[PDB]
Amino acid sequence: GQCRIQKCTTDFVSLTSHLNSAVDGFDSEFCKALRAYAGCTQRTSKACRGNLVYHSAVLGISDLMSQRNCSKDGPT
Amino acid sequence: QCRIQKCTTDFVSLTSHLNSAVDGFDSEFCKALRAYAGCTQRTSKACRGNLVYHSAVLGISDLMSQRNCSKDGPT
Amino acid sequence: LKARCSRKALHVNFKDMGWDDWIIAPLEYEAFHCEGLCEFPLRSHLEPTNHAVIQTLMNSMDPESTPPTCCVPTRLSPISILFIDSANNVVKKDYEDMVVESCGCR
Amino acid sequence: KARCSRKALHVNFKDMGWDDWIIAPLEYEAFHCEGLCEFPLRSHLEPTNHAVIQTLMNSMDPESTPPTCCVPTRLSPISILFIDSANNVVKKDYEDMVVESCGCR
Ligand SMILES: *[C@@H]1O[C@H](CO)[C@@H](O)[C@H](O)[C@H]1NC(C)=O
Ligand SMILES: [Cl-]
Ligand SMILES: [Cl-]
Ligand SMILES: [Cl-]
């Protein structure tokens, strides 16, 4: 009902905290988590309007997906 | 009154230009440390119980030991 | 070179971030940031907590027992943002803690 | 490569020689904060608006600003029994002696 960006972030952090670039599938698992994070943040966009945590999540997610070459469409 | 901040300001002012990569760091530092030690000793009684003071005294003493700055010497 | 804890420039351009689709004004502001060494002794204007006084002491005596304290904002000020809210209305609101006014070791 | 956390930090006043004026406690757990502040900051790191923006900008361009820093965001006092200047036994709360939470600022 309200702004729920913190849930999205918690999920993303929980899902990726262990990830280490020294292991094989880092980038794929990371991109999957990023797409899920992007989707979760998108679905709470209206309630979160004006919340800098929300707006920076949206932009930081988009930027990370560009940096890590994650397709916008793909598995989560 | 506890005047530790005067001692610290002086020490920081006097060493602010010091760059560890420049050739005379330790000698100017020790003179500065010795003056800092003297200043902190002159306000010791007023500063008992003041954590900034007690930390300064111990930090100075430790640095003078670490850097082998003699107890007495130019300031 | 390794500067001591200081307030440095940090320009925030909301238009470059694409946030002008909800922010009306300002579209940029000076946020500053804090950066630099927290060394023994902490100068009075770094305004340390008792904890930071002790940690800086301990890191000076034994840099392996504890890391140094960190140069972070110790006073911040708000900026007023005019934006389009969730109800699609113009809203003026103070955003607290947006501009670094002072840096210190914590 | 640990993320911002509260870590142990034991303070021993007797080892520091402060037992000539501190009566009790002669040691306490102060804790300290240490670790990476990475985008996205979890809620419990309680960033300021400024830290939110700085972490974002450092994520997008590490050259534009450094990351935010792991520091105590909540602290608690300890009661110290000591002798003051006038040889009075004093019991005083020393504020901000114990890290209760760490966060990114
Ligand atoms: C993303 O693609 C760019 C361009 O090929 C490359 O330089 C970069 O290393 C890639 N990063 C990842 C995480 O795949
Ligand atoms: Cl992908
Ligand atoms: Cl002398
Ligand atoms: Cl305005």
mmCIF file of all heavy atoms in Angstrom, chain B residues 1-18:
data_model
loop_
_atom_site.group_PDB
_atom_site.id
_atom_site.type_symbol
_atom_site.label_atom_id
_atom_site.label_comp_id
_atom_site.label_asym_id
_atom_site.label_seq_id
_atom_site.Cartn_x
_atom_site.Cartn_y
_atom_site.Cartn_z
ATOM 1 N N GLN B 1 40.377 25.900 34.262
ATOM 2 C CA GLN B 1 39.543 25.130 33.344
ATOM 3 C C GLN B 1 40.391 24.183 32.509
ATOM 4 O O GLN B 1 41.597 24.382 32.374
ATOM 5 C CB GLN B 1 38.747 26.068 32.432
ATOM 6 C CG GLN B 1 37.728 26.927 33.161
ATOM 7 C CD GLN B 1 36.595 26.112 33.757
ATOM 8 O OE1 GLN B 1 36.426 24.933 33.439
ATOM 9 N NE2 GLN B 1 35.811 26.738 34.627
ATOM 10 N N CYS B 2 39.772 23.146 31.952
ATOM 11 C CA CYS B 2 40.508 22.250 31.072
ATOM 12 C C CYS B 2 40.746 22.941 29.741
ATOM 13 O O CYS B 2 39.795 23.331 29.056
ATOM 14 C CB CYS B 2 39.761 20.940 30.860
ATOM 15 S SG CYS B 2 40.730 19.800 29.856
ATOM 16 N N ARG B 3 42.009 23.102 29.376
ATOM 17 C CA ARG B 3 42.377 23.821 28.167
ATOM 18 C C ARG B 3 43.109 22.906 27.194
ATOM 19 O O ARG B 3 43.975 23.333 26.432
ATOM 20 C CB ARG B 3 43.201 25.059 28.522
ATOM 21 C CG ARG B 3 42.474 25.996 29.485
ATOM 22 C CD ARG B 3 42.348 27.405 28.921
ATOM 23 N NE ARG B 3 41.587 28.284 29.807
ATOM 24 C CZ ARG B 3 40.290 28.549 29.671
ATOM 25 N NH1 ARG B 3 39.600 28.007 28.675
ATOM 26 N NH2 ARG B 3 39.679 29.358 30.528
ATOM 27 N N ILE B 4 42.725 21.631 27.175
ATOM 28 C CA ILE B 4 43.359 20.678 26.273
ATOM 29 C C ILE B 4 43.200 21.101 24.821
ATOM 30 O O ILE B 4 44.101 20.884 24.005
ATOM 31 C CB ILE B 4 42.791 19.261 26.500
ATOM 32 C CG1 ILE B 4 43.465 18.273 25.549
ATOM 33 C CG2 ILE B 4 41.292 19.241 26.298
ATOM 34 C CD1 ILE B 4 44.951 18.117 25.804
ATOM 35 N N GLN B 5 42.066 21.705 24.468
ATOM 36 C CA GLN B 5 41.846 22.023 23.062
ATOM 37 C C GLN B 5 42.828 23.082 22.575
ATOM 38 O O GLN B 5 43.198 23.082 21.395
ATOM 39 C CB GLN B 5 40.397 22.456 22.826
ATOM 40 C CG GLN B 5 39.319 21.440 23.295
ATOM 41 C CD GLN B 5 39.361 20.067 22.595
ATOM 42 O OE1 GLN B 5 40.228 19.789 21.761
ATOM 43 N NE2 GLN B 5 38.405 19.206 22.944
ATOM 44 N N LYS B 6 43.278 23.971 23.465
ATOM 45 C CA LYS B 6 44.339 24.907 23.096
ATOM 46 C C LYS B 6 45.615 24.158 22.740
ATOM 47 O O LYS B 6 46.244 24.436 21.713
ATOM 48 C CB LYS B 6 44.612 25.899 24.230
ATOM 49 C CG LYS B 6 43.608 27.023 24.368
ATOM 50 C CD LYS B 6 44.143 28.127 25.281
ATOM 51 C CE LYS B 6 45.137 29.026 24.562
ATOM 52 N NZ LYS B 6 44.455 30.053 23.729
ATOM 53 N N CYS B 7 46.010 23.195 23.583
ATOM 54 C CA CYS B 7 47.200 22.393 23.308
ATOM 55 C C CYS B 7 47.079 21.677 21.975
ATOM 56 O O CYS B 7 48.025 21.646 21.181
ATOM 57 C CB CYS B 7 47.423 21.366 24.416
ATOM 58 S SG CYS B 7 47.532 22.073 26.022
ATOM 59 N N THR B 8 45.920 21.073 21.723
ATOM 60 C CA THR B 8 45.731 20.327 20.487
ATOM 61 C C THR B 8 45.759 21.245 19.277
ATOM 62 O O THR B 8 46.405 20.936 18.272
ATOM 63 C CB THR B 8 44.418 19.564 20.556
ATOM 64 O OG1 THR B 8 44.508 18.665 21.658
ATOM 65 C CG2 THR B 8 44.165 18.796 19.258
ATOM 66 N N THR B 9 45.046 22.366 19.357
ATOM 67 C CA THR B 9 45.051 23.331 18.262
ATOM 68 C C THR B 9 46.475 23.732 17.899
ATOM 69 O O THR B 9 46.859 23.721 16.721
ATOM 70 C CB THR B 9 44.219 24.555 18.642
ATOM 71 O OG1 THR B 9 42.859 24.158 18.869
ATOM 72 C CG2 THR B 9 44.260 25.609 17.536
ATOM 73 N N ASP B 10 47.282 24.070 18.912
ATOM 74 C CA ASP B 10 48.680 24.424 18.675
ATOM 75 C C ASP B 10 49.421 23.299 17.976
ATOM 76 O O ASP B 10 50.127 23.521 16.986
ATOM 77 C CB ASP B 10 49.371 24.754 20.000
ATOM 78 C CG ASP B 10 48.945 26.089 20.554
ATOM 79 O OD1 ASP B 10 48.274 26.845 19.816
ATOM 80 O OD2 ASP B 10 49.262 26.379 21.726
ATOM 81 N N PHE B 11 49.285 22.077 18.491
ATOM 82 C CA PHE B 11 49.991 20.952 17.894
ATOM 83 C C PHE B 11 49.558 20.744 16.451
ATOM 84 O O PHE B 11 50.389 20.515 15.565
ATOM 85 C CB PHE B 11 49.746 19.680 18.697
ATOM 86 C CG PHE B 11 50.419 18.486 18.111
ATOM 87 C CD1 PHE B 11 51.787 18.303 18.275
ATOM 88 C CD2 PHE B 11 49.696 17.557 17.371
ATOM 89 C CE1 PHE B 11 52.422 17.207 17.722
ATOM 90 C CE2 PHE B 11 50.323 16.455 16.812
ATOM 91 C CZ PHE B 11 51.682 16.277 16.984
ATOM 92 N N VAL B 12 48.249 20.802 16.205
ATOM 93 C CA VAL B 12 47.742 20.612 14.850
ATOM 94 C C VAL B 12 48.187 21.755 13.948
ATOM 95 O O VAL B 12 48.611 21.530 12.809
ATOM 96 C CB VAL B 12 46.212 20.458 14.876
ATOM 97 C CG1 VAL B 12 45.640 20.500 13.464
ATOM 98 C CG2 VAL B 12 45.843 19.153 15.587
ATOM 99 N N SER B 13 48.110 22.993 14.439
ATOM 100 C CA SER B 13 48.598 24.128 13.658
ATOM 101 C C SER B 13 50.057 23.917 13.269
ATOM 102 O O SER B 13 50.430 24.035 12.098
ATOM 103 C CB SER B 13 48.431 25.420 14.462
ATOM 104 O OG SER B 13 48.658 26.571 13.662
ATOM 105 N N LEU B 14 50.873 23.522 14.241
ATOM 106 C CA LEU B 14 52.313 23.424 14.057
ATOM 107 C C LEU B 14 52.714 22.284 13.129
ATOM 108 O O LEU B 14 53.773 22.352 12.495
ATOM 109 C CB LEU B 14 52.974 23.239 15.421
ATOM 110 C CG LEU B 14 54.488 23.296 15.510
ATOM 111 C CD1 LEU B 14 54.982 24.633 14.963
ATOM 112 C CD2 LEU B 14 54.905 23.118 16.957
ATOM 113 N N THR B 15 51.908 21.223 13.056
ATOM 114 C CA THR B 15 52.222 20.061 12.236
ATOM 115 C C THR B 15 51.352 19.948 10.993
ATOM 116 O O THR B 15 51.509 18.982 10.238
ATOM 117 C CB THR B 15 52.060 18.780 13.059
ATOM 118 O OG1 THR B 15 50.706 18.700 13.508
ATOM 119 C CG2 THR B 15 52.988 18.802 14.256
ATOM 120 N N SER B 16 50.439 20.900 10.766
ATOM 121 C CA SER B 16 49.491 20.790 9.660
ATOM 122 C C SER B 16 50.192 20.728 8.313
ATOM 123 O O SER B 16 49.705 20.069 7.387
ATOM 124 C CB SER B 16 48.522 21.970 9.681
ATOM 125 O OG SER B 16 49.203 23.178 9.397
ATOM 126 N N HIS B 17 51.326 21.412 8.181
ATOM 127 C CA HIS B 17 52.099 21.427 6.948
ATOM 128 C C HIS B 17 52.929 20.170 6.752
ATOM 129 O O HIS B 17 53.501 19.990 5.674
ATOM 130 C CB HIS B 17 53.053 22.612 6.955
ATOM 131 C CG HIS B 17 54.172 22.443 7.929
ATOM 132 N ND1 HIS B 17 53.974 22.447 9.292
ATOM 133 C CD2 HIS B 17 55.494 22.223 7.741
ATOM 134 C CE1 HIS B 17 55.128 22.259 9.902
ATOM 135 N NE2 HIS B 17 56.067 22.120 8.985
ATOM 136 N N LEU B 18 53.053 19.331 7.772
ATOM 137 C CA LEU B 18 53.922 18.171 7.660
ATOM 138 C C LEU B 18 53.314 17.149 6.713
ATOM 139 O O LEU B 18 52.127 16.818 6.800
ATOM 140 C CB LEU B 18 54.169 17.553 9.031
ATOM 141 C CG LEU B 18 55.042 18.390 9.966
ATOM 142 C CD1 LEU B 18 55.200 17.659 11.290
ATOM 143 C CD2 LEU B 18 56.399 18.683 9.346
#
